[PDB]
Amino acid sequence: SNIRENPVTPFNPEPSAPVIDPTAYIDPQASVIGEVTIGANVMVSPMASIRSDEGMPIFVGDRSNVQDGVVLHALETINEEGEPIEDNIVEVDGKEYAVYIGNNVSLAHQSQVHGPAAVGDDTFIGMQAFVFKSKVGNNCVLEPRSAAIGVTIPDGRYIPAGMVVTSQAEADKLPEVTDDYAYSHTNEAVVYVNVHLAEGYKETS
Amino acid sequence: SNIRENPVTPFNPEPSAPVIDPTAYIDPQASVIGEVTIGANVMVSPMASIRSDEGMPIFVGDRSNVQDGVVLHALETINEEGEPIEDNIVEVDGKEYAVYIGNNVSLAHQSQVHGPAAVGDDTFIGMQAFVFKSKVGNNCVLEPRSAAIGVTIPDGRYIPAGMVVTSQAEADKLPEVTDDYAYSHTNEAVVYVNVHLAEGYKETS
Amino acid sequence: SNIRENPVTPFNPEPSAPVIDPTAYIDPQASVIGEVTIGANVMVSPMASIRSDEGMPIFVGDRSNVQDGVVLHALETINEEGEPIEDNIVEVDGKEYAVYIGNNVSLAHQSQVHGPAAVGDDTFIGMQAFVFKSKVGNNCVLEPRSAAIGVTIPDGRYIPAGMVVTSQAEADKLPEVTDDYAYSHTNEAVVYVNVHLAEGYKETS
Ligand SMILES: [Zn+2]
Ligand SMILES: [Zn+2]
Ligand SMILES: [Zn+2]
């Protein structure tokens, strides 16, 4: 089976199985392992790997999409002695996650979000982009091949294609998404399409 | 099955199944979905995903290769109201495609070509490279980690490793492939090898 | 089966099957083909592809990990006329390999090491990083999105995130891993975790 429990290890005493909304579509060639929650109308495409086997949940909010070859994984959040590693946990609305993906988020082909990380609602994470140890705000755009490592990206900003942002001083001066910006409407279109693809693929299973 | 029809959606009234030349080899761990044409002697490796579920064909010409982890996908080419979105369609020799991959093209491991896009004959698309909203000419070389977004790359040019080309002014001044250039013979060698691998893998199936 | 022999071709007269230590865990959604040796306690994650079908061995040493979506492959090491192509072979301790991955090495999600290449013991190859025609020394760190092409990286150096190193003059001036460097202890932690995950996954198979 491609939907599986995580294994017992010294940093995971109890196996968890994924919690998947009945309206989500998980492609038979995707892999989803461990403590993962997947929301309504989510589409998970071929060759994606969502793997939560180091403690703490990976959460994927409603109407989000995880496209082909995307990887979601996270650093250990509980060490061998049962002690939570706080640096490796993100807090969102009073709850703790290893990776939090909000609602209406697009994780486009071959991107990767590696915990600890949070991605706010209505954000587009572009093809081959990378997010690690970062909080990306709502209504953001990571263009293809951009990356955010160790930073907070404020709401409504975009990172130009290929730019690797590693310092908060850079993240603070990112340009704003405006109506005339080339990717300002991209995520809404991708979400609309993927919500419809998820329902169409569900009707073939 | 790993070779599948696309689903019915408001931008796809009729499911299509892939058309695959009998001499092509599709690895059992690759995924090929929807309106896709694959030419003669093509090799499709493990973990590649070719997904044509948003309208319009993805075409992969003869003696081309789609290596491990490569993704081919495309933006919607017909909106909900049946109206073709012309910006998202490329024209090649009088026919319309979402993605056109020519003959003798190598899409090397983990690269991605996302429609609208066309890649001309005898071109090498290097490892982890990215092509989106671009036309790449014949006899080109995209070195590993290069990218072409929103541009036309003239015939016989190469993009140095890591360079992300987003403006036509840059694409126009790319260097030329000459006989002494390190990758000038790479594609011919890769095509020769992959045509032979496809036949060898076919003899094990 | 996801563990398979390579095919017969003019540059491979005899099929080889992988040699895998009984303590290694190969995920059912990984692919391992051909002349590959995998050492003790190695973890191979979903969607990884290790493909040795062009001649010469790919070796993965003990306690190493090959994470989700990683690709290992190599250029031809024997031409059609039986003649070894010496440029495409690396020598390690008196033996020849197409790709050599040492002991305690982490190949993190979506990275790629393409032969000819060697990676020394206790080295971390970061997420989405790329190594090709290079020798990476022991105790090195390739940060996420870095790349080494055509160079030798001395022992104990790191390549900052996003940096693409293509000339020996650059590789010679890379900074040194010191105790205060942010990734100085990353590999030891990742190895420890992955050795334990491999044993936990083995207990579920
Ligand atoms: Zn990880
Ligand atoms: Zn797409
Ligand atoms: Zn290769």
Could you tell me the two tokens for B10? 């408001």
Could you tell me the two tokens for C180? 């205060």
Three-state secondary structure readout of chain A: CCEECCCCECCECCCCCCEECCCCEECCCCEEEECEEECCCCEECCCCEEEECCCCCEEECCCCEECCCCEEEECCCECCCCCECHHHCEEECCEEECEEECCCCEECCCCEEEEEEEECCCCEECCCCEEEEEEECCCCEECCCCEEECCEECCCEEECCCCEECCHHHHHCCCECCCCCCCCCHHHHHHHHHHHHHHHHHCCC
Instruction: Say whether residue B164 is in contact with chain A using an 8 A CB cutoff.
Output: yes
Output the DSSP codes for B119-130. E-TT-EE-TT-E
In the chain, the amino acid numbered C57 is P
Is residue B108 a contact partner of residue B125, using CB atoms and an 8 Å limit? yes
Q: Mapping DSSP to helix (H, G, I), strand (E, B) and coil, where does residue A56 land?
A: coil
Burial of A126 (0-12, 13-18, 19+ CB in 10 A): buried
Instruction: Say whether residue A67 is in contact with chain B using an 8 A CB cutoff.
Output: yes
* CB atoms inside a 10 Å sphere around CB C172: 13
Three-state secondary structure readout of B73-104: EECCCECCCCCECHHHCEEECCEEECEEECCC
Residue of A47, A41, A49 whose CA lies nearest to A65:
A41
**A68 assigned to a ligand binding site:** yes
**Ligand minimally distant from the alpha carbon of residue C50:** 3
Contacts of A6 (CB under 8 A, 6+ apart): A12, A15, A16, A33, A34, A35, A52, A53, C200
Ligand 1 centroid distance, CA of B119 (Å): 34
d(CA A200, CA A45): 13
d(CA A57, CA C183): 24
Ligand 2 centroid distance, CA of A22 (Å): 24
Q: Residue C32 forms beta bridges with which residues?
A: C3, C50
Q: Which residue has the tokens 């994650």?
A: C45
Own/partner pairs, C189-195, CB within 8 angstroms, 24+ separation = C189/A76, C190/C65, C190/C106, C190/C108, C190/C124, C191/C63, C191/C64, C191/C65, C191/C104, C191/C106, C191/C122, C193/A11, C193/A54, C193/A76, C194/C43, C194/C65, C194/C106, C195/C41, C195/C43, C195/C63
In the chain, the amino acid numbered B19 is V
Alpha-carbon Rg for chain C in angstroms:
16
- Across chain A, which distance is largest between two alpha carbons, in Å? 53
Alpha-carbon Rg for chain B in angstroms:
16
Is residue A121 a contact partner of residue A61, using CB atoms and an 8 Å limit? yes
Is residue A124 a contact partner of residue B111, using CB atoms and an 8 Å limit? no
Could you list the residue range(s) of the whole structural domain that residue A51 is in?
A: 1-205
d(CA A190, CA A173): 27
Is residue A77 a contact partner of residue B83, using CB atoms and an 8 Å limit? no
CATH code assigned at C38: 2.160.10.10
What residues in B contact A201, CB-CB < 8 Å? 7
Domains identified in chain A, total number: 1
> Inter-chain contact C110–B109, Cβ cutoff 8 Å?
no
Please tell me the experimental approach by which this structure was elucidated.
X-ray
Q: What resolution in Å is listed for this PDB structure?
A: 1.8
d(CA C105, CA C87): 24
Q: Could you give the C-alpha distances from C168 to B54, B120, B202, C88, C152, in angstroms and in order?
A: 45, 33, 42, 18, 7
Contacts of C94 (CB under 8 A, 6+ apart): none
Burial of A180 (0-12, 13-18, 19+ CB in 10 A): exposed
DSSP category for residue C190: H
In the chain, the amino acid numbered A121 is D
Chain Cα centroid distance, residue B48: 11
**C53 assigned to a ligand binding site:** yes
Tell me whether strands C31-34 and B130-136 are parallel, antiparallel or unpaired.
unpaired
The residue count of chain B comes to: 205
